[PDB]
Write an enzyme that holds these catalytic residues in place. Structure first.
Site, short mmCIF file in Angstrom:
data_model
loop_
_atom_site.label_atom_id
_atom_site.label_comp_id
_atom_site.label_asym_id
_atom_site.label_seq_id
_atom_site.Cartn_x
_atom_site.Cartn_y
_atom_site.Cartn_z
N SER B 203 0.84 -1.18 0.00
CA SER B 203 0.00 0.00 0.00
C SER B 203 0.87 1.23 0.00
CB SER B 203 -0.88 0.00 1.24
OG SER B 203 -2.02 0.82 1.02
N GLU B 327 -9.16 -5.02 -4.20
CA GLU B 327 -8.48 -3.87 -3.63
C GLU B 327 -9.44 -2.82 -3.01
OE1 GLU B 327 -5.29 -3.38 -3.25
OE2 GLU B 327 -4.39 -5.03 -4.37
N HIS B 440 -7.80 -5.44 0.43
CA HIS B 440 -6.54 -4.73 0.59
C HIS B 440 -5.83 -5.04 1.93
CE1 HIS B 440 -3.99 -1.38 -0.69
NE2 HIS B 440 -4.06 -0.87 0.53
N1 HI6 Z 1 -6.06 11.74 7.55
C1 HI6 Z 1 -6.29 10.80 6.53
O1 HI6 Z 1 -5.71 10.90 5.50
C2 HI6 Z 1 -7.28 9.63 6.73
C3 HI6 Z 1 -7.84 8.99 5.62
C4 HI6 Z 1 -8.70 7.97 5.82
N2 HI6 Z 1 -9.03 7.55 7.11
C5 HI6 Z 1 -9.98 6.43 7.29
O2 HI6 Z 1 -10.29 5.64 6.16
C6 HI6 Z 1 -9.35 4.83 5.64
N3 HI6 Z 1 -8.88 3.71 6.47
C7 HI6 Z 1 -9.61 3.34 7.54
C8 HI6 Z 1 -9.21 2.27 8.37
C9 HI6 Z 1 -8.01 1.56 8.09
C10 HI6 Z 1 -7.26 1.97 6.97
C11 HI6 Z 1 -7.68 3.02 6.17
C12 HI6 Z 1 -6.86 3.38 5.03
N4 HI6 Z 1 -5.81 2.71 4.76
O3 HI6 Z 1 -5.16 2.94 3.70
C13 HI6 Z 1 -8.50 8.15 8.18
C14 HI6 Z 1 -7.63 9.18 8.04
#
Ligand code: HI6
Ligand code: HI6
Ligand code: NAG
Lengths: 533, 541
Positions: B203, B327, B440
């Protein structure tokens, strides 16, 4: 022979007894349905034929409406079978009638054939339009008319009194009225009239569906490989005025003065220049075609199909497997009937600009990107077959899918097909597959003539098709009404999108007429060209 | 020193370490955990390039994992293993620049090929200490030397005022580079071969690996690279200088803050204040977008990854790249209305159009319409099941699969030897619903060989499969070729090429060669979409 003597509103006719393989048929050929559209009547709406004295000889085909004659492959059977097979003349408004012999004792369903030829050519006298088979085997009454083509039928100065446009379709309409008034004398049922046509004939049939004064003159319609909607079948009033004005310029000529000079011009002079008025280098585009006049066509065909009420209508529509191949050998470099037409990528991009002549650069790229096989982006065999698909989809398949879906959604009973049998006698090379126009000889039942060298399974296949078409004419449903046993031909609907394959094997029901690809053409491309204007 | 295990004492450039003897299913391994490689990037050093760790005195205890870098913590499904496995498992601190080493026990006789892991987590989260990144299995079964490093994430790692001295951006990548340098200097003390170093990551970790490929000063620190479900090119891995500036400035405002004065004020803010606001500076409602990521600075990255991969020479490089089957699914249940881990997520056509705008947040209206028209099933335009799956594919294709295709293609055309895979096995232990397929991040546990641990309840087949994946990866690290030379009978993994476009399926069945990485759809994303976006002026950015 009293079977050959008929009285119509205009006087007496003598027809001729013909042999069909299964027995005799009565044929009445060359019946005038209008005053010859000559001299000052050039470009004018047709007028009804004045009554005649004595017995008019109706035993032979009349002249072909004045038109361009193709010379690309001189004396090659595949091009010549469409060329005029009678003398050329502006005096050409005649129709033909085949009936069973003896004349049907009960009123019989009438089929009325409208030939295609891009609105610039065609004749009801070609061998592939021979009605004796449908008359003999199926007991049908069959009618075909000549109508004006090219400038003579469609040159329009919108709003002018003397060239209002659409007079070629007005010729068709007059022939339709003639059938209403007269077909009963031949044993025909005027309360059961089915129009059928191919390519520009299908589009004509389409216009008749979409033009109110025509609707009282028929009950069902068949559109083979052509639609009133789509990119080639009509022009705006403005574009027709431009093309007529340009043509007038090319031959030496307010509206009245311009049309007056045009009327002095010998026929071949107009034909010599008609093909020089297209705005772009193209294929599947025609100089003089029906015009959105606000009259015959009250609005664009798209507007009219999107909003019409078609609840009382039954329509049968369909395509052939390779709609595009025929047109490639006429305008696109690298294509020929005499080789495999294996093209380069460069020639493919070039071919797309010609096949989609109205496209912006970006729309043209979208087409290339859609039809390229990205597993084999440079493979000549793919590129060639793709080029054909572009032309066929853009011009026939997707417009047909649009029509079928719009008609079905608005109350019409719709049946759709795709025709996949390649004639054993076909003279075009293999790579062209089943080209535009080559289902017709089967529908008309030509294989039933032993002298034509068709295979026996083709004879059997031809009888199936004549049965479907005439069952459709009789009842609005192509299915045999007492033959059981699967498979039945289901109605096309927007929900399930069922259509059938016509080939040597039994009917197979398929779902979706190139749905993904036609979504690109019908839904995305307009939004694109719109934004990239 | 006197009565301790003589096999766990090692000296590096900065001093003496004491490691720990770990238990793996097949035998002991050596672990050296929490080795500092930088001065702690705290106080006046926040936002700054890492400075190399100054030597210590005495024996540094290296028997436990160190602090995890200060980061946002996901709380969407409290107590659910599917989210918890990714959460920090050590204390959060800006003092977090430490790395870990696992080696055979006793340490190897001859110099051994080294693997360096770089974790993902959207450049805003992650840690080298998570259970799924446990190097003990690779070390024990394959004899590998494995290194993983913490790097700064979020604002601390990626907030940039491009051109400034105090916040030049990309410092998280510089943390990784410093760890790579540390490996060059020090790995031989553990039996590692500094002349055989293979980077791998998933990733954002993969994107990071790709950036080291594209950044000259990194290139002398490694020899081969693996990119799992991520690329330096594509829509999320980088932002322009202008965009990075705009985000830094907005975040500054949100916390109460001339670049010097601004940054200085930021340095006075509690770490938590920064974390609490970082997510609030995204220009549109989105998924698969992250606030603070590598910036195209004209320095670490001399140009955009897209320009660099188009013109670069990659002859002396071997790369292994691939994707999981689904993904996109993971990202839907976080941000797209209609989606949940707790139901079948059958959505409406309306919910699909709304999901496309969120999943392609930079798209003009027409571009979005194109996406919708391309992914609609026109035989069943309103079927909730196809819509659900299409939404998944949109997000997966746009973010991972097609950027991966573009990478493999460009690297191959320009002289790199490339191997490509699709990972298609769904762990029998997976807690996500069936509709999400193979989401993913869920190949990672197989590559690291977790199924070899009996107590984790994987199937026997899964154990054999994990063993297979481990061979592939270590064979590739060893030789630049995932195939076993001592195995002729077993099906070969051919290189990916522009002409043939071959990749393999990774599942319980033997290898299967397939052609074309979603070639038709990726033509849409990679060739058409950018031309279509070109036709639009107001606005976005
Ligand atoms: N500050 C940020 O960029 C952000 C973006 C997305 N999320 C939550 O959604 C995505 N997400 C949520 C839970 C675990 C992993 C992921 C992404 N992994 O790539 C939190 C903060
Ligand atoms: N688009 C063209 O240039 C073109 C060239 C030649 N023809 C010839 O049509 C013969 N034909 C006429 C009617 C049905 C099938 C085939 C049509 C269009
Ligand atoms: C699934 O659950 C989420 C949240 O509870 C909800 O938004 C979504 O509409 C649900 N879907 C169905 C089909 O019930």
């Amino acid at each position: 022979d009293p079977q050959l003597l008929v009285r119509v509103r205009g006087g007496q006719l003598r027809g001729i007894r013909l042999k069909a393989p299964g027995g005799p048929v009565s044929a009445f050929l060359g019946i005038p349905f209008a005053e010859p559209p000559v001299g000052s009547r050039r470009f004018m709406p047709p007028e009804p034929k004045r009554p005649w004295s004595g017995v008019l000889d109706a035993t032979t085909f009349q002249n072909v409406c004045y038109q361009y004659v193709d010379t690309l492959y001189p004396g090659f059977e595949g091009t010549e079978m469409w060329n005029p097979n009678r003398e050329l003349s502006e005096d050409c408004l005649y129709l033909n009638v085949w009936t069973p012999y003896p004349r049907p004792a009960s009123p019989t369903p009438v089929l009325i054939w409208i030939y295609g030829g891009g609105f610039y050519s065609g004749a009801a006298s070609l061998d592939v339009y021979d009605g004796r088979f449908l008359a003999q085997v199926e007991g049908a009454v069959l009618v075909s008319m000549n109508y004006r083509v090219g400038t003579f039928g469609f040159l329009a100065l919108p709003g002018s009194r003397e060239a209002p446009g659409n007079v070629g379709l007005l010729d068709q309409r007059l022939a339709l009225q003639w059938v209403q008034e007269n077909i009963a004398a031949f044993g025909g049922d005027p309360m059961s009239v089915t129009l059928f046509g191919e390519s520009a004939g299908a589009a004509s049939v389409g216009m008749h569906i979409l033009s109110l004064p025509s609707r009282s003159l028929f009950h069902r319609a068949v559109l083979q490989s052509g639609t009133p909607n789509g990119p080639w079948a009509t022009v705006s009033a403005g574009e027709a005025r431009r093309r007529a004005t340009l043509l007038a310029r090319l031959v030496g000529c307010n509206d009245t003065e311009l049309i007056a000079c045009l009327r002095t011009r010998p026929a071949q002079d107009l034909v010599d220049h008609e093909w020089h008025v297209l705005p772009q280098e193209s294929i599947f585009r025609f100089s003089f075609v029906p015009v959105v006049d606000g009259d015959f066509l009250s609005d664009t065909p798209e507007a009219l199909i999107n909003t019409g009420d078609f609840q009382d209508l039954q329509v049968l529509v369909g395509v052939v497997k390779d709609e595009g191949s025929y047109f490639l050998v006429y305008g696109v470099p690298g294509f020929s009937k005499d080789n495999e037409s294996l093209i380069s990528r460069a020639q493919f991009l070039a071919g797309v600009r010609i096949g989609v002549p109205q496209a912006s650069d970006l729309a043209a790229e979208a087409v290339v990107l859609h039809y390229t096989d990205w597993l084999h982006p440079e493979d000549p065999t793919h590129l060639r077959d793709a080029m054909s698909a572009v032309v066929g989809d853009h011009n026939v398949v997707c417009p047909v899918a649009q029509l079928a879906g719009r008609l079905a959604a608005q109350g019409a009973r719709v049946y759709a097909y795709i025709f996949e049998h390649r004639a054993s006698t076909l003279t075009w090379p293999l790579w062209m597959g089943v080209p535009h126009g080559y289902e017709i000889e089967f529908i008309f039942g030509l294989p039933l003539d032993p002298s034509l060298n068709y295979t026996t399974e083709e004879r059997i296949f031809a009888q199936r098709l004549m049965k479907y078409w005439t069952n459709f004419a009789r009842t609005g449903d192509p299915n045999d009404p007492r033959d059981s046993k699967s498979p039945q031909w289901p109605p096309y609907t927007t929900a399930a999108q069922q259509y059938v394959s016509l080939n040597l094997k039994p009917l197979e029901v398929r779902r979706g007429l190139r749905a993904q690809t036609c979504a690109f053409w019908n839904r995305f491309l307009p939004k694109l060209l719109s934004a990239t204007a």
